[PDB]
């Protein structure tokens, strides 16, 4: 209220002590627990923690990978937390050599069950799947307890070193010959409405385009064949209901200079990846386009 207190400078949070420090200091005792510096206090990255069975956590022990929950009409295990690579197993976009590579590592009773639940129901994938963000730490227990982030950067505790985002080469997709200073990274599930297969194409779009109309124009321009396949399935097969030939959502934005080619190793199996070092997640809902 006073002009001294109003024009007083704002208080540094790192200079003032914790509530526990002043609480212990008031009654003046001592505990064996060191309390004077609380960890994770200066953490803008709001995180969450997820239990998941052992059969899905391979190629995840290295930090930095997507995580997607699904829905299944069965009641008790109803939501599986599938990694992006097990999602890419199902996708028709990936090369068959890499497909037989990363299927050979994911031989588990939970992974094949998730693969059956992907293609069992009548729903398409975009009405079924739901992102969570990228993962930063593992637990590697008998069941695994991963730590994903909803918003913010990807870093180790104490912020000693930043965590990168990994994506396989086949899901990587750019639409410009040179990049801007900033570029967003998206998710694309495009639907081939073909007779024999309905397996989609999975992509990430490291593009410098933020506006949705100027993004969806280039999205239609690069995926004209898929919309032509959609309208061909519309005219050839009557009384069918096709919808959302491609879907699009925002995943984050990168530094546009640390993007480089590295590789993941799990059980001496190389898997080449595009790696984005200083990256912050930024989630959004599944918009669609036809």
């Amino acid at each position: 209220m006073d002009a001294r207190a109003v024009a007083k400078r704002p208080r540094d949070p790192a200079d003032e002590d914790n509530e526990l420090v002043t609480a212990l200091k008031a009654k003046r005792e001592v505990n064996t627990i060191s309390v004077r510096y609380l960890y994770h206090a200066d953490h803008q990255a709001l995180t969450a923690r997820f239990f998941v069975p052992e059969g899905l956590v391979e190629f995840e022990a290295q930090p930095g990978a997507l995580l997607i929950r699904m829905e299944t009409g069965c009641d008790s295990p109803r939501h599986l937390y599938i990694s992006l690579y097990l999602l890419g197993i199902r996708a028709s976009n990936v090369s068959a050599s890499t497909r037989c590579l990363l299927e050979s590592v994911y031989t588990a009773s939970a992974a094949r069950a998730a693969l059956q639940w992907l293609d069992l129901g009548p729903h398409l994938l975009h009405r079924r799947l739901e992102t969570l963000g990228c993962v930063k730490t593992v637990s590697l227990g008998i069941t695994s307890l991963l730590t994903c982030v909803m918003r913010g950067y990807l870093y180790n505790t104490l912020k000693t070193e930043v965590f990168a985002l990994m994506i396989p080469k086949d899901m990587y997709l750019t639409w410009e010959e040179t990049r801007g200073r900033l570029q967003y990274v998206y998710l694309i599930i495009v639907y081939d409405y073909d007779g024999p297969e309905t397996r989609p194409g999975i992509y990430v779009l490291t593009s410098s385009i933020a506006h949705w109309q100027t993004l969806v124009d280039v999205a239609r321009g690069k995926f004209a064949r898929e919309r032509c396949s959609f309208v061909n399935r519309r005219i050839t097969r009557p009384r069918q209901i096709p919808l959302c030939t491609g879907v699009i959502q925002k995943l984050g934005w990168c530094l546009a200079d640390d993007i480089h080619t590295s590789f993941l190793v799990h059980k001496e199996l190389k898997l080449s990846v595009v790696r984005l070092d200083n990256f912050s997640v930024e989630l959004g809902d599944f918009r669609e386009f036809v």
Binding site: Q213, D217, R220, V231, R234, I241, L243, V290
Partner: protein
């Protein structure tokens, strides 16, 4: 743009005197130089494709609700929306809940793909303006 096709130049000159006058919130405004462009061709192509798709996915009940309401009900808005339509108790031939909810979801998708053309983006959400209408506060940047 949709009226620029297959029309005489004086028809466009008789259309621009109708369409340039916008009097939103008691303040007139004019549209400068409405010309043809390749981006406008892209918007017209996606507009005609979305219109064809929603014309195809429209069921008979959505197509007949206006006549089913105009046969019995009577209002000023019903009259004002009926005169822009064309000229030409019965049981429905075939209805189904599960088919038609899928039809309505795909139809909502097509109306979204039509809606995104005119709706650019939200970039400011005003909370309180200044009372001289010269400033405001906003969120969502």
């Amino acid at each position: 743009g949709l009226f620029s096709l297959d029309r005489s130049y004086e028809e466009v000159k008789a259309a621009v005197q109708q369409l340039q006058t916008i009097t939103f919130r008691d303040a007139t405004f004019t549209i400068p130089d409405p010309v043809i462009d390749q981006h406008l061709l892209i918007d017209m192509k996606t507009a005609c494709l979305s219109m064809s798709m929603v014309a195809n996915l429209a069921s008979e009940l959505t197509m007949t609700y206006v006549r089913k309401l105009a046969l019995e009900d009577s209002s000023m808005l019903l009259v004002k929306c009926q005169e822009l339509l064309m000229r030409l108790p019965a049981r429905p031939q075939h209805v189904s809940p599960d088919d038609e909810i899928a039809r309505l979801s795909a139809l909502f998708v097509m109306l979204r793909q039509l809606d995104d053309l005119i709706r650019e983006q939200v970039v400011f959400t005003v909370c309180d303006v200044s009372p001289d209408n010269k400033s405001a506060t906003c969120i969502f940047k």
